[PDB]
Amino acid sequence: SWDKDVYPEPPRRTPAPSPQTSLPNPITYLTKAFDLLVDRPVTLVREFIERQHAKNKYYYYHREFRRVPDITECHEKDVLCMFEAEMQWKRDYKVDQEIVNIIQERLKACQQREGESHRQNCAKELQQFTQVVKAYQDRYHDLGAHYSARKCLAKQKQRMLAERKATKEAA
Amino acid sequence: DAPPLTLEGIKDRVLYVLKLYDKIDPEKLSVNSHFMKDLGLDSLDQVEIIMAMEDEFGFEIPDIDAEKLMCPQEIVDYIADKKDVYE
Amino acid sequence: FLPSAAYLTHQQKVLQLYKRALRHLESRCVHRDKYRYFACLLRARFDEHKNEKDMVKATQLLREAEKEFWHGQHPQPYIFPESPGGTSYERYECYKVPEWCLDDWHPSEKAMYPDYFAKREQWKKLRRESWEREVKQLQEETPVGGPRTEALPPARKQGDLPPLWWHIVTRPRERP
Amino acid sequence: VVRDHWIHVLVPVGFVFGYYLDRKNDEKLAAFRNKSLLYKRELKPNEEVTWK
Amino acid sequence: FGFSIVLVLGSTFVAYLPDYRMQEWARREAERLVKYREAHGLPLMESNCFDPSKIQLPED
Amino acid sequence: GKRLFIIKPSGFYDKRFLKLLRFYILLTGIPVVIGITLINVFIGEAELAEIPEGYVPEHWEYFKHPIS
Amino acid sequence: MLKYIIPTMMLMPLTWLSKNSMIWINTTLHSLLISLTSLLLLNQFGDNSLNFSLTFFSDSLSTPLLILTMWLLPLMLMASQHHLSKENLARKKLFISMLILLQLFLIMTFTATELIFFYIMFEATLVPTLIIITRWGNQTERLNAGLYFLFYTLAGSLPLLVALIYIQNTMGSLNFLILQYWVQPMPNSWSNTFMWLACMMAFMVKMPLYGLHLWLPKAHVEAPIAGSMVLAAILLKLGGYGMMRITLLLNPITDFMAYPFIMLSLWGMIMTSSICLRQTDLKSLIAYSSVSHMALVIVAILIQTPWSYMGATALMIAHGLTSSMLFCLANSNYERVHSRTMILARGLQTLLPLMAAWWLLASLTNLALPPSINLIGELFVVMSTFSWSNITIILMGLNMVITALYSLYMLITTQRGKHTHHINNILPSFTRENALMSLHMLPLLLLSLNPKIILGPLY
Amino acid sequence: MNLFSSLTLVTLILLTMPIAAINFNTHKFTNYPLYVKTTISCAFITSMIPTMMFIH
Amino acid sequence: SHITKDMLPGPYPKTPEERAAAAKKYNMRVEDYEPYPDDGMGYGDYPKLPDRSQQERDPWYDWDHPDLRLNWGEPMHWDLDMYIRNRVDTSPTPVNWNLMCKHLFGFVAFMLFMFWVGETYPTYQPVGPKQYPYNNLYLERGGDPNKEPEPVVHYEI
């Protein structure tokens, strides 16, 4: 399985055929042939593997963390503080990359399930895609290659200062 | 892609397609017979001979060997050189 | 530019123009019957002044005939599928392996082909045994200080093989 | 057999020697054994260490 | 010692090795955080990733 | 005399190299792949469980695959 | 990595005190031991780099280069016989120990935490290869070639020392980590211009740039085979590695003064693909090919983009493998015909029948065949530079076209069409040479399957 | 549905086999064209089916 | 191992002795041995040839080398690296040169001129628009599922 919380799926809508023919039905003959040929021993191999690993078990977990406080709660030098701040920041950056990955995967799914109803029931998912990617363009984009953490925060002050003065004069 | 070829067969074929030509007699046609010396047929029509036998066997003999054969036996020699027919 | 002499001749140049014009006419003039007609026409046009004893008249009309030949040549003539430029032109160069090789085979493979390799051994001894005396003697004596030709005489002196036979005779079969 | 050829014995012993020197360097740089903020837990419950 | 114990053992050691750049860790963590920001109602990936209440702008 | 002797360059050095190459990769190609087949047919990966309370995990046993 | 360093020292004296006819086996065996031994290093996990006390560290910018060098050593050594095999026992032990000491300085250079140490070990890389190419330079102006090499590498690399002492006494110590942390921008004065010009100029000479790329061809046509491979792969990709290090500082002035270097590299990359289209002298064409690939590398390093850095280190590793292979095949052909010219060695489809397959495979790796790592590198360079200037794709694609052209031309020129029927001295291919072929290209394709190792720190 | 997926995947993967076969043979298929002919015949008969299911 | 004196320093002068020694050094015709002249372009004292060399030299002369059209003592022309067969076939042209280039560029210009005529004069058939139902197909353009209807309808003829 997986988490349908994070990976939503639409309700299944399967139509039913209706012959109205006397061929009679070659493709049903062949799909029953495929199931009764391939599907039995592969399921039995699955059963064998399940039991033989169901003798004894292992366990893997998810690595969870604490929270080191801030970068603006570190001073001008503070190597034993800035290090914690940057590593926490860079791990946030990596998991945000995978956030954008998952949203793009949802967009691919929306293109594929709709077929040629492109402009219906993909406004929601493409719209939230544009929202998160507007956020990502604003926040993590125009910083270049050698990001440390401080270039991000200088960008942060630059952006909010410029938009503050622009909405100040245009208020 | 490899037909059977003999010296006798190719010699008789060259002598055949010589003997079909008009202004030489079928009478005095010899395997040893100089086209220049003792038959008296012209060198120009000897190059017509060269042209037609080239066209039959399907490869150009060069201009530099369009000079110095003058007899059917050396013609069989040069065609056996191009075709590599010995056993 | 020929292995016998330097000058070609008047007659050789006339004759090569004849072969080229007739071959071009083959390419231009399909169905072969109107070709045969025009071949007699070309042979007659050479026979219009075959009677010329002159030399400057012959080469002047030959030059005008070269103008006339290049005037009506053909783009892709019927060149043979063995002639250079043609369709094959070492088509079957896929297995023209040179004959100096086969010395470097593993002795299992030379155990596979016994009698042929014994025959190549006695050929190679026939080469080496008959290289010193007759060939080196005829390459001392018969070359003049200027050789001045691209063709050697055979060993008509007394006995065995003419010189330089090896990489002339022992050429591949042109046939895989 | 080893005194026959002592040739190929040099660099594996050199590698194990260097690995011991790295472990001694770990012991010599044994500062802040649990003195981070993000990696900071209780020394518990087996025996009196957190990493070697 | 050049082709057998080296090449294919290196290939098995590198075709699967631990999670380089914390990757599947980051997969599961991004999945659970998307679950978090969906089930809590608040929008995902807000800007000002550092605290906008904790800022000082030197003005004119 | 239909058949003739065509001239191969040489075969045995080339075939000997390729033979030794595939054999002395295969010498630990079969045992390694069959060994890891025995791994994922006997021991299997792990369960997807979570960190319990009152627990100090090692830095291994965060990993699915047992060889890793 | 000191557990990897002390067998690099102690791999030397065995080669001295080994008996005769036995140095070869011992060196090869222990080299492959250390190859796996430092292949075990690869646990660069996630956020940080991995450190060892005050001397050693590892990004992903250094670990595949390290594994590449220790992979190179048996290849390096095993190519390097049969032209000095009949020479003396003492001189041969001297040669092999010289290569080993060279690689020890290389590993010191690739794991250089500090930068003054990096300069010292940089010219420690410089010095032994001089001795090797000058004792066994194989041709008539090895004098000239070694001299150009030594004076270009010093007189480029020397003011880098003064610039690094200037950075030393303006920002404390020269650890890579503090320079990640205590960096501050250095504006568009002229002092920053000269400092950037000094550091980047030293590395421009190392790559080489096109403005001083006459350094390279003499240094390859008059070198032995082990020196050729080490020179090309490890020295040029080490120069790129050093630029990748010290470009972390000096952010804003490279926006100004990065313009003429990228220009010179682009147009001279095209002129270099022009120059290796028409020359003779089969060995030198790969040298100019390496000039063009390193110009591509240089564009990638100065445009300062994460795509660019990933594709750049990919192009480093792939071009190191392909160039070392193609030098080895050039050595095989010169073992055959003793010529080094191109129009003499012709044909060779029947003769050496499976050598052609490795020639073809190398020319396709230099093609940018698409699943190969070469095309991953060149493609991400093109993506980054098209984000950078949006019209520069003309020279990138024209480089691609002429690069494929000359690579396939050198393929079908030497080894396609007709044996010249006077040779009498080609031998069927030795098991050593084909063993080196499999040493080159099987790890390349197994890298091509799972290339998530070799990408840059901005992964 | 699993059938259509497995049938398209075998119409790809039933082509890979003969190349790896001759790289792992060391012996001579003199009837190597017959081998290639029968694997292309298998590929065509497993590729005529899922198109019919597709338009079905 | 080779004689230093059979290499090629300097240009042509002096005209008796250096021409004599170079003509005996390269084995050509003596007075037709050409310097370039001393153009200062490097080039030493190396000869100049009639520049075509490969689709001349017909293969029935039957010299030594198979495809270089070479015979092991020849001037080895300076621009042979551009002249090899498979690279530049300097055949005698079947028509001309000026005739070829002028007719080709003129035909391309003629076709592109009438292409501009096609770009300015379209064709069409006596046809109006289609009749899309929802205000020229709303909700299958960009969207706005609850915001912007613009009422414009279809009328029959």
From Swiss-Prot, chain G:
Segments forming a coiled coil: none
A Pfam family of this chain: Proton_antipo_M
Entry keyword set: Electron transport, Membrane, Mitochondrion, Mitochondrion inner membrane, NAD, Respiratory chain, Translocase, Transmembrane, Transmembrane helix, Transport, Ubiquinone
Any GO MF annotation of the entry: NADH dehydrogenase (ubiquinone) activity
A Gene Ontology BP annotation from the UniProt entry: mitochondrial electron transport, NADH to ubiquinone
GO cellular component: mitochondrial inner membrane; respiratory chain complex I
Membrane topology (UniProt): Multi-pass membrane protein
Enzyme Commission code(s) on record: 7.1.1.2
Catalyzed reactions per annotation: a ubiquinone + NADH + 5 H(+)(in) = a ubiquinol + NAD(+) + 4 H(+)(out)
Subcellular location: Mitochondrion inner membrane
Transmembrane parts of this sequence: 22-42, 60-80, 98-118, 147-167, 196-216, 224-244, 256-276, 284-303, 308-330, 351-371, 391-411
InterPro entries to which the protein is assigned, alphabetical: NADH4_N, NADH_Q_OxRdtase_chainM/4, NADH_UbQ_OxRdtase, ND/Mrp_TM
Record keyword NAD present: yes
Family listed: Belongs to the complex I subunit 4 family.
Functional note: Core subunit of the mitochondrial membrane respiratory chain NADH dehydrogenase (Complex I) which catalyzes electron transfer from NADH through the respiratory chain, using ubiquinone as an electron acceptor. Essential for the catalytic activity and assembly of complex I.
Subunit structure: Core subunit of respiratory chain NADH dehydrogenase (Complex I) which is composed of 45 different subunits.
Protein name: NADH-ubiquinone oxidoreductase chain 4
Name of the gene: MT-ND4
UniProtKB/Swiss-Prot annotation, chain H:
Source domain of life: Eukaryota
Transmembrane residue ranges: 4-24, 43-56
Subcellular location: Mitochondrion inner membrane
Coiled-coil annotated residue ranges, if any: none
Assembly description: Core subunit of respiratory chain NADH dehydrogenase (Complex I) which is composed of 45 different subunits.
UniProt family annotation: Belongs to the complex I subunit 5 family.
Function field: Core subunit of the mitochondrial membrane respiratory chain NADH dehydrogenase (Complex I) which catalyzes electron transfer from NADH through the respiratory chain, using ubiquinone as an electron acceptor. Essential for the catalytic activity and assembly of complex I.
Name under which the protein is recorded: NADH-ubiquinone oxidoreductase chain 5
Organism: Ovis aries (Sheep)
Positions spanned in the full protein: 1 to 56 of 606
